[PDB]
Subunit: 32 residues, 3 copies
């Protein structure tokens, strides 16, 4: 696994966490 | 294209959408 | 640094900015 492949896998995981965080905040602002 | 090429262009598309959603939510919060 | 490596560098920078924006917006929402 090259450094480039390692970095991409890490980015996939980071972007998944950001998406969940964003989704939660959008719903926190909706305040249903 | 290779898996790495695919993963990188996919990440580019996702982060663009995240940026747009964040832009929108920032504006929404400010306007509330 | 190849093009693919540069795209990954730029994704790293973008995700850092997005994480910061999310942090600030979460704080804004909790404060307001
Ligand atoms: Zn969720
Ligand atoms: Zn949701
Ligand atoms: Zn939900
Ligand atoms: Zn694709």
């Amino acid at each position: 696994v090259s450094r480039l492949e390692e970095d991409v896998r890490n980015l996939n995981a980071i972007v998944q966490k950001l998406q969940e965080r964003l989704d939660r905040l959008e719903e926190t602002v909706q305040a249903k």
